[PDB]
């Protein structure tokens with residue numbers, strides 16, 4: 172059970188914006204210019220790390 | 221019959237074919253709130269925060 | 270003139286002039302389904318919508 | 319199609335918040351609203367998040 | 368019109384989003400009719 176929960180939580184953490192406009196990287200890179208996309212991707216990277 | 225809606229948190233259970241078959245209103249009673257916290261319609265014996 | 274959008278997923282009544290491409294099944298492909306951008310393999314499904 | 323929007327008169331202020339000017343025509347939107355009004359030059363800056 | 372009062376029971380639940388979900392439990396914050404709430408019968 173414990174292991175499952177951990178993995179489950181990890182998967183749910185992929186659905187968190189962490190302050191970014193979207194939780195999907197492809198949507199961000201298809202929505203914003205590379206400079207601001209860098210900032211949003213940076214927030215997502217920090218959260219996921 | 222006329223009733224009025226309210227902002228509520230519901231736990232909805234979807235069946236195999238995709239239709240909602242049961243729901244739990246979190247703010248109704250302590251047992252329903254426990255179910256919402258555990259994300260299950262059955263609660264085993266114990267004390268749950 | 271202030272243009273107000275809402276960015277979400279599939280359900281959308283407005284897209285850019287981008288044309289279409291015939292469906293491909295059982296191959297790992299990039300897909301843009303009505304604003305939903307992803308990559309995967311597309312198969313016929315028995316899910317009841 | 320934002321090609322005609324660009325083809326209209328040169329814009330004193332064309333700033334895109336959620337999205338990126340050029341990345342428009344590449345997105346798919348749920349409810350476009352446009353608000354038209356006439357304001358003074360210094361009042362343009364006040365129309366911003 | 369004559370007003371009586373009755374119990375709504377577990378009535379008034381609707382699909383919140385345009386998303387198909389199967390064999391899952393989903394939590395939704397939305398406007399719903401509270402369970403076991405008093406509703407008015409008008410004649």
Ligand SMILES: *[C@@H]1O[C@H](CO)[C@@H](O)[C@H](O)[C@H]1NC(C)=O
Pocket residue numbers: 236237317
């Ligand atoms: C509900 O699911 C059962 C189990 O597969 C299926 O036989 C039935 O056709 C489904 N009903 C509807 C309305 O989808």
Ligand SMILES: *[C@@H]1O[C@H](CO)[C@@H](O)[C@H](O)[C@H]1NC(C)=O
Pocket residue numbers: 372373405406
């Ligand atoms: C609805 O019914 C309950 C149970 O009898 C009662 O306590 C409550 O006062 C009723 N609602 C109104 C508005 O009278």
